[PDB]
Amino acid sequence: FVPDVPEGYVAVQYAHRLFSSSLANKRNRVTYTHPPTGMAYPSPTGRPH
Amino acid sequence: QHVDAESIMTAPKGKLFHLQFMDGLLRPEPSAFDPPASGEDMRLIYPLQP
Amino acid sequence: QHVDAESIMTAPKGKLFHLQFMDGLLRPEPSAFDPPASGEDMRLIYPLQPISVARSMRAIVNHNEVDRPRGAVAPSSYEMDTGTLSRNGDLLYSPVANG
């Protein structure tokens, strides 16, 4: 069994550049920046599929 | 102190839980060059009222 | 170490002073609610010329608010061009362009 990727998901090649240190609510969280939207996501929760 | 969701769910009515809450307004800001720490604080139980 | 202005002024020519300097780029920022301290750091002796002539790199740290810290210095490309050995035996940099 290989789970299919669900219809809404977006392909993203891993690259060191996608992850960074950043301030977020008095913490230096490992922010991830989505390559399409450009949006930064300090929490692992709430990230785009 | 901490309150298990298990006790919130299984205690008889009439029990008086004692929840604690942080006022994080005065929490220190991280140094600009300190590497990020892994992990994430989460809260499960919330007030319904002020 | 510290150097008195008195010694700067009274030493025979030929003496070799050893001045120290802070790179305060990585100095910690104060907490937002900490009360101010009294007193003021002062510097009296200064270089007449650039001092960090040996400096290949600087501030190898991430900054949370910004893409690169101000004053961060990358290594020059030349440190990293292995180049080639010429038939003479002289080392060469890689060609900038074909031909």
Side-chain angles (χ1 to χ4, degrees):
Chain A
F1 175 57
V2 184
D4 298 320
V5 317
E7 187 180 0
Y9 283 55
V10 164
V12 163
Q13 290 286 322
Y14 167 82
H16 282 54
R17 105 184 48 92
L18 303 185
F19 299 89
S20 12
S21 178
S22 77
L23 227 217
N25 300 315
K26 285 106 172 308
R27 270 193 70 189
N28 273 335
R29 301 180 85 0
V30 192
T31 188
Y32 152 87
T33 66
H34 205 17
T37 52
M39 185 62 178
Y41 297 96
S43 184
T45 327
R47 297 187 175 171
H49 291 343
Chain B
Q1 284 175 12
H2 298 279
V3 178
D4 41 324
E6 178 179 0
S7 65
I8 271 308
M9 283 297 229
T10 62
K13 183 211 305 182
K15 164 147 192 302
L16 194 70
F17 301 87
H18 181 75
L19 277 51
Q20 299 186 338
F21 298 84
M22 207 79 87
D23 174 27
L25 174 47
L26 294 197
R27 93 215 325 273
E29 203 183 2
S31 177
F33 308 108
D34 289 21
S38 193
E40 189 166 18
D41 301 320
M42 310 284 296
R43 183 158 209 117
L44 192 65
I45 313 305
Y46 289 92
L48 249 349
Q49 39 166 139
Chain C
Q1 284 175 12
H2 298 279
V3 178
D4 41 324
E6 178 179 0
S7 65
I8 271 308
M9 283 297 229
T10 62
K13 183 211 305 182
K15 164 147 192 302
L16 194 70
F17 301 87
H18 181 75
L19 277 51
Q20 299 186 338
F21 298 84
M22 207 79 87
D23 174 27
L25 174 47
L26 294 197
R27 93 215 325 273
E29 203 183 2
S31 177
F33 307 108
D34 289 21
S38 193
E40 189 166 18
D41 301 320
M42 310 284 296
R43 183 158 209 117
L44 192 65
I45 313 305
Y46 289 92
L48 249 349
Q49 39 166 139
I51 278 305
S52 312
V53 288
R55 180 183 64 203
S56 169
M57 264 171 297
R58 194 185 182 200
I60 304 191
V61 287
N62 286 313
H63 191 275
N64 49 11
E65 285 91 35
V66 299
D67 297 330
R68 48 187 292 135
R70 68 172 311 176
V73 171
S76 70
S77 51
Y78 300 102
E79 303 177 6
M80 317 183 304
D81 185 26
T82 189
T84 61
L85 225 230
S86 75
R87 206 203 305 274
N88 191 69
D90 297 28
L91 305 159
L92 306 185
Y93 288 121
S94 299
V96 190
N98 193 274

